[PDB]
Amino acid sequence: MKTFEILKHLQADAIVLFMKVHNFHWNVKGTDFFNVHKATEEIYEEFADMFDDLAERIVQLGHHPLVTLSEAIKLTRVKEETKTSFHSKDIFKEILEDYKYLEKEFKELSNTAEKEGDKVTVTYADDQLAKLQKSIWMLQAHLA
Amino acid sequence: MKTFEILKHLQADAIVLFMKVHNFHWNVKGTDFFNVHKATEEIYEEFADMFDDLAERIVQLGHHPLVTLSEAIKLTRVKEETKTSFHSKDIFKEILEDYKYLEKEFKELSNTAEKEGDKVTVTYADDQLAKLQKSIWMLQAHLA
Amino acid sequence: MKTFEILKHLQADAIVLFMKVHNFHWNVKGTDFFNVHKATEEIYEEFADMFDDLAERIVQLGHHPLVTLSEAIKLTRVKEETKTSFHSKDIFKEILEDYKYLEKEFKELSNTAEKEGDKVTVTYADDQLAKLQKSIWMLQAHLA
Amino acid sequence: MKTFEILKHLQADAIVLFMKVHNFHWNVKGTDFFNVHKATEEIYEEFADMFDDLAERIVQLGHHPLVTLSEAIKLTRVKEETKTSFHSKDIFKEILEDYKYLEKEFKELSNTAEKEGDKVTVTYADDQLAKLQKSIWMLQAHLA
Amino acid sequence: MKTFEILKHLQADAIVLFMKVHNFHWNVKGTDFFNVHKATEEIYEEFADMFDDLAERIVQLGHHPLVTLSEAIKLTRVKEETKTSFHSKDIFKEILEDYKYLEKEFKELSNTAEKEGDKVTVTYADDQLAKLQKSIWMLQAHLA
Amino acid sequence: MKTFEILKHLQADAIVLFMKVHNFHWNVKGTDFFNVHKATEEIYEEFADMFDDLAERIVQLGHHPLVTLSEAIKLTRVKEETKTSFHSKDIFKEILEDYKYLEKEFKELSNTAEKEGDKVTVTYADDQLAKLQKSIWMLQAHLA
Amino acid sequence: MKTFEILKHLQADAIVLFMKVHNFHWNVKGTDFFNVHKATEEIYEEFADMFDDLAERIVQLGHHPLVTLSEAIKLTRVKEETKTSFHSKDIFKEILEDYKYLEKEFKELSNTAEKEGDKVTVTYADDQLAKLQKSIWMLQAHLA
Amino acid sequence: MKTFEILKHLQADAIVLFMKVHNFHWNVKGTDFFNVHKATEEIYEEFADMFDDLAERIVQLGHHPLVTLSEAIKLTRVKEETKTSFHSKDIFKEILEDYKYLEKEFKELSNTAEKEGDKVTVTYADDQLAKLQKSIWMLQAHLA
Amino acid sequence: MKTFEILKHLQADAIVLFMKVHNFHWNVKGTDFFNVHKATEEIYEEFADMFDDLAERIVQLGHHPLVTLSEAIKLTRVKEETKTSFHSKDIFKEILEDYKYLEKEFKELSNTAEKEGDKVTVTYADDQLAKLQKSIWMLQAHLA
Amino acid sequence: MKTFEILKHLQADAIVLFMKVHNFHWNVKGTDFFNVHKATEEIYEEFADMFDDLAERIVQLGHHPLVTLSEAIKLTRVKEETKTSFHSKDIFKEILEDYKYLEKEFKELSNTAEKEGDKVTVTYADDQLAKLQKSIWMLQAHLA
Amino acid sequence: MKTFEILKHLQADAIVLFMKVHNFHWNVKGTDFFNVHKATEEIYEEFADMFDDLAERIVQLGHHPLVTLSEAIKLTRVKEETKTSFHSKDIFKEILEDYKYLEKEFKELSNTAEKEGDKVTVTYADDQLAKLQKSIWMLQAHLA
Amino acid sequence: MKTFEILKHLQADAIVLFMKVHNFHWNVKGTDFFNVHKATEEIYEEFADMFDDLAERIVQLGHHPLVTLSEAIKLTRVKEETKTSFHSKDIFKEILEDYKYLEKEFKELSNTAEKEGDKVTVTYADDQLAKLQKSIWMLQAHLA
């Protein structure tokens, strides 16, 4: 894809993930409650920021960002969670799965943005990669 | 409807509105840019909070909150905006329209919650009513 | 009862609960220690505030608040905990039991204060109800 | 009266009281000086806020707030203080008298706003009632 | 006039202006709303401070400050605004008119205080002159 | 007594004193109201902290802290106040009496903890002694 | 005197007054204790600053500031207080007496500095005059 | 050019732009005044920082930064503005023109620094590019 | 000269000095580095503020401030420094020389502004004089 | 040993423990991850401070602190951990073991410093003892 | 001496030292100016606190603190500095001399307070000893 | 080497340097004391952070970080300092030597990480390079 197309897909995943971790946030069960309730909030706050940055990068690039939830679920590569009750372990396995998926997408973003000579989208991609890789480590350590 | 059903519809509108004012936030054109770009951010921050409060009130009430964007666009009473370029005036007319709609919904919430004896949902509804009514005044003054 | 009588009973429970969660605070055992030690502190800080608000509302109402620990254990509906060692689970079951009891009492407070036309005691009662209901949800989610 | 008429009278009293406690603020005499000089400042800061809230509630309600000092002294139920020297005791007796008067007015506001179905003016009235009742207690305790 | 007489007239204008910019604050109409609503608040906050400083300078000088709204409208040189709806432009023209008037008064204050050897009233007058002159520039630039 | 026995008695007095100064806090009468209402709050906040520190020192020492209000009134050396109305002077005489009593107890604590080689309980005791002695001076100066 | 000579005398009074209000600070007796203990601290903090500013102005002026307590008691016009116990009233009468004395000295400073063309010492003098005159008013109101 | 030569030219433009936006800052006319007066201040604060960073990067690189205004106007590629009165629109068109020019220069900087293996100058260039591109978008949206 | 002409010359010196101390800031050599690097930054921050205040005072006065670096080097009385390496001592001698020059200019400003009756420019001049005289003392002490 | 010799051994253990809890910090596995990752950071921050305080106390005492990692592993009484993966339980058992060891060492420090008349090293030792004893309690409660 | 007599002598030295380091503060000459000017300020701020603590400890002990500068120079063991110009080195040698003297006095204080059983004066003495010993090290390192 | 091998060597140098600058921190002698004592603290705080970041990057990369001081001195390229007394100049020469060494290592890290496609390790390396190059400049300027 072109850089802006990768950006729009990533933007779609951000809003879908924002909704998804809210689900984990509200419906966690178990003696783990306080910690995951607290952690998921920080996570969706981050997706809200990513959602906004991706969209603004797209307009700076001269293109159209997704502007409706309808376009978003049409472009996501993230499956929506319909369940309404979870335990810590399952929540972290899913978040880990989605994080690994985002990491691949940001690597593509970084690679194709570089070929186009898009210096600033590349550094944006590399910064998100850094955050994702640190969290993936922590998620994996937690599940070990 | 029952209190929790009104809450779920309101929750649906919150996430749809969150997306909608982001659109206004990114695509404003005109010498008004900085102000509306700044204002819309405060507004969607508020919808993000409302979205979370509504959902948690629903689980406290023993019911299921919407957990997917798909359920959300199925329950909204808010029309999604597909346009990608706006001028201050049109943005504020739409926001005003949606605010007036939310005010009616929160009045129903307050009324039916009261009949059920749901004291805390009533005060929540009345607090949102207060914020909505102050903003509606400001929106109308702006368009005068 | 009359509003001030409900207030005095609630005041009695506040100081008894203040002592009770201190017990949980000092005597928790288990890998859960840090979290419950931290949580119980926030909880008894809250009871200390409730204890003071209830008492001052009573004097504003023209009556006498409980002024001795002796009157307090004579008026409580809360059983004192004599054990000196606990595990997370048992602590949260007890706190949940006591919270549910307080919720019923604050509902009575709200109801009878309303019949007397006591507008401000009603809003006080409804605010405490809101906090109690949110915590009851979290306590229950934790024990699930 | 209608809700907005009660609001305008209350608005009139707020600006008149704002001026009145400034008088006490500047002209206190006695070893009590620092405390009452400090207390009266907090009090008129509060009236300035009340003055603004009442007025904005009136415009939100679709009516006209008082916009001149002339209309204000025409609508007050508060007598203006012409003396320019006071001692702690007399200052607190007057403030107490005026507070008791405001409490009756806010009770009417709450009652008539409720009959009209004005949910948000009712909660505003009840919140002011709470503050007034706490201060009335303290004023009375001080004069005992 | 004598220094204290100029001070009392200025004190009268301060409370009248405090009321006047509140009117502009509540009744602005137009796409300018947020800015002037915000600006007028800062302005009346300033008049509230000026009102208090003038009055306290008068008592320090051994005289009586105005203590009633009635004395105030009897001493002002500022005309009260009876209209209840305005647009940015008209609001700023009026504020500018009143600021220019205050500047002349503070120049007289500074001049006559100096002849009396009143060192501290002179520096107070000169400081207000500085603030007034900066705002007059900004008001004029705005209307250009 | 043994160090932990002195600690438990002190813990008992802390909760009893916490209740006692709340009484003074709510029921002060007189032109002194604001100051003593404010001072008593700081004092019971301190007893709440002392109550918690004493108890935790006891568990660190391998013993059982008091965990019920019932055990507390069985171990106190502090008489509970049944009156519900006081004037500044009487409040400070009582607080002074109780402070002098606590000072003797902390001196014993310091002395016997030292004989046992309990270095940290000794420094805790000496720190409380410092605070008590400064307050006793201020209380006495106030009553002079 | 010459400006620097007035400055040195003022510097002498500052350190003597710093010591004097410490005496009032430590030895106040009476139900007024907390307030005057608190007020005197703010006052000597101010004298410490004045002491430093006066001295640095003298070196900026090319002269020698007092550098010993011995030179200070040789140059003061302030009588040292040998008593070690006071009541609020006597403390404020003395402070008032000394403040009135400082005001005369700062007026001379302002006058002679002006004749010499010393612009910055004049504004320093006038600023201190402002603070002194406000406090003198408050001291006098307190003693009325 | 060599990296340090591009850096010196950029440094020259920074100080020239610092002066230029001050002009816009002082001489804006129109109902837009407050906003552009505020915005231009943030902009020249940024140029002051850029000016300092560029210069220090040059010395770190072992070369000489421009040290006089004379060398600066000899090296700029930015035309100085001699007019002394402007309206919002013209100010933003000029700033936009200059920003687009800076963006091209920072792209060259990034490109040539990379060929030389200058890792840190490249990241500096890319960070400035990011800020410039976001502002260019906002400037363009404003002028649309 | 007329007040505004003195102001424009001072404005010219401010921007030239801003550039000059940046030179000292970047090119200091010696074990003194950290201190002078830190000090020079505070100094040019001050000149940036002075530059802005002078210019705005000129427009408030109804005249034109310098708006180009070209006009600035045409009006300065300050010689630009072309050297690119310095040691602490030489830097402070130059800064001292320039400060003494600014002091003379601000004295003229104060004197001629006074003759014109320009009260606020006089206090501005006297405030800068105060800062300059304190720094001149410190600079001289440093070089002694 | 002599006081300074005990101090050097303690200093050696501090840097070794600093490294050891970093290991636990990076290599924790399990659903406990976030908590122990967070806790271990606070712990090694503390050892870094202890390391610095011990060393500076030694130089104040006129002796040489350890200045190389080589001297440190030669003087420690703490065994280094070579494993690179742990679970909460094992981490806390080790930390507990090392804390108990440090407590014995600080008791010796306190005892021998006292015999030498080293007042300040004694209070330092007693303060560390206090922190260690509180943590040992919490560690033990956690493992129960 | 008795504890209170040692305290009074120490109190005398505190005010004399407060004056002495002010002298160093104002009259330092040399490229060291900024650092010692800054350091001496922190030092006399400390003596001001020590002066107040010593005095209040004396009244808590039931004795009379020095209340005049005259009593102070009669009790000091510190020689007053009459010179008005110094260089870094001489300032630090003197401060070091006086610090070593204070250390001996605080050791006596600690020793005799202990024999009297004065627990809190002992900890006060030991805390000052700690601060003095750290500064003595730094002073000596500086002079090496 | 492979990226993780370079990371482990860098991690080894970080802990060795952390110890080394502590030595400079404790043992500086000379009138430079305060500045270098303060500077070295900021430096070792930085190495502590670098030590932690390097180690966590290694685990994120799927490898083992150094977990013992023993492995560290086996892998460093940094020579340990055995001396216990230094003067400013020697301290800065050593730090400069070590910084230049770290810069070469981070350049290798950046280069080899890039060949492996390790985007985030590259940006980490480039950021450290930026900090190192700025400090190297300052160190060199200081020694000039």
Ligand SMILES: [Fe+3]
């Ligand atoms: Fe945004």
Ligand SMILES: [Fe+3]
């Ligand atoms: Fe939430």
Ligand SMILES: [Fe+3]
């Ligand atoms: Fe209270």
Ligand SMILES: [Fe+3]
């Ligand atoms: Fe308002």
Ligand SMILES: [Fe+3]
């Ligand atoms: Fe006031």
Ligand SMILES: [Fe+3]
């Ligand atoms: Fe605790």
Ligand SMILES: [Fe+3]
């Ligand atoms: Fe100073």
Ligand SMILES: [Fe+3]
């Ligand atoms: Fe810089």
Ligand SMILES: [Fe+3]
């Ligand atoms: Fe400006």
Ligand SMILES: [Fe+3]
């Ligand atoms: Fe240190």
Ligand SMILES: [Fe+3]
């Ligand atoms: Fe004190």
Ligand SMILES: [Fe+3]
């Ligand atoms: Fe870490």
